[PDB]
Amino acid sequence: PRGSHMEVWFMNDKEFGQRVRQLRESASMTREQFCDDELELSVRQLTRIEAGASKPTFSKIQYIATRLGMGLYELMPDYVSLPERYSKLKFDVLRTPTYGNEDLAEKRDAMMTEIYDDYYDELPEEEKIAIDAIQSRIDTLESGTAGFGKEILEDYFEQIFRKRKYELNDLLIVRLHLEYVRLSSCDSEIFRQFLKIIEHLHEQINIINSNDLFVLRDTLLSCVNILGSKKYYEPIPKIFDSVDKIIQSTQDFQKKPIVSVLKWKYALFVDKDRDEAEKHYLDAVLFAKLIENRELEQKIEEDWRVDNQ
């Protein structure tokens, strides 16, 4: 029962929003009643969907349908899942180890451009924000990212803090909240919140899908830099514990050198104990020798030299 088979007009963002409103209204529900606890779908998120300014993710359409008693395809007959080429590019981008490889970091940004050229403009909203979360930087505390103003992102952030189980896009979108922490004082609300996020991310390890663990790992590593920018070194060791325990379950091992460097830097610059630091330096070298990556080995050798001036 597709739109092409009934010969009807295709529902783009506006005219779909129009339908979602109709069905909600005629079922005597208001936005506040409809969204309920706002975990899956928020009131602000719904308003923009009805307005035609935001395209819903699969999980959101699913919820909108179930909440109206309808099937997914009864609501959106012409629904299609995310392009296979897009989902591949996203996956490759997120799984690229950058440190030590100049060549792979070049393929990474190449993929990102292909995403922006071909698929980004037609993704659902949550998916756009998650792609931006990969490498967008916020210059100003008042402003948002490109395309999206703060009030949107806040709504997504608040949604995630309440969630019991983070999806892959939640683990990405959180990374934008970190860019706001960078601009705020150590005394701020935003910072004390950011510490609660770290607490959440730890508990998420034994809750999220096994397959998503690699994104969580890298999100926890993003916190180390941020904690460093505020000289709040206390929770860094526990991050390392968790990152190592994730590396064990996943059997991924690509971040072993990155972690060992970060471990030496803590020992060297925070603890000022370069007997303990040199140990991790040697692990990273041994690793780079075993996988036979000269570039990585030379990078590790160089950084160690730089850090003893």
Numbering used by the authors: -4 to 304
Describing publication, verbatim:
However, the construct used in this study behaves mostly as a monomer in solution when assayed by size-exclusion chromatography. The observed dimer interface between the TPR domains appears to help promote crystal-packing in this structure and the two monomers exhibit an identical conformation (RMSD = 0.192 Å2). The monomer is shown in Fig 4B, revealing that ComR S. suis is comprised of 16 α-helices divided into two domains. Helices 1–5 (residues 7–72) constitute the highly conserved DNA-binding-domain (DBD) and helices 6–16 (residues 79–304) comprise the tetratricopeptide repeat (TPR) domain that is the predicted site of interaction with XIP. As the active form of Rgg2 shows a domain swap of the DBD domains, the observed conformation of the ComR apo structure appears incompatible with DNA binding and would require reorientation of the DBD domains. This is reinforced by the observation that the DBD of ComR packs tightly against the TPR using α-helices 3 and 4 (DBD) and α-helices 8 and 9 (TPR) to form a significant interface region. Indeed, relative to Rgg2 the DBD of S. suis appears to be held in an inactive conformation to occlude helices α3 and α4 from interacting with DNA and possibly inhibiting dimerization. Although the DBD is highly conserved, the TPRs diverge significantly so that only one side of the putative XIP binding-site pocket exhibits sequence conservation among the ComR species in this study. This creates a “conserved face” and “variable face” on opposing surfaces of the cavity for potential interaction with peptide pheromones. The homologous residues of the inner pocket are electropositive (R103, R170, and K250) which is likely required for optimal interaction with the C-terminal glutamic acid moiety of the ComR S. suis XIP.
The ComR-ComS receptor-signal pair is a regulator of competence for genetic transformation that is broadly conserved in a majority of Streptococcus species, including those pathogenic in humans and animals. ComR proteins are members of the RNPP (Rap/NprR/PrgX/PlcR) family of QS regulators, including Rgg, which are prevalent throughout the Lactobacillales order. ComR is predicted to contain an N-terminal helix-turn-helix (HTH) DNA binding domain (DBD) and a C-terminal tetratricopeptide repeat (TPR) domain, which contains the site of pheromone binding. Once activated, the ComR/XIP complex binds at the promoter regions of comS and sigX, thus producing a pheromone-dependent positive-feedback regulatory loop and activating the SigX regulon.
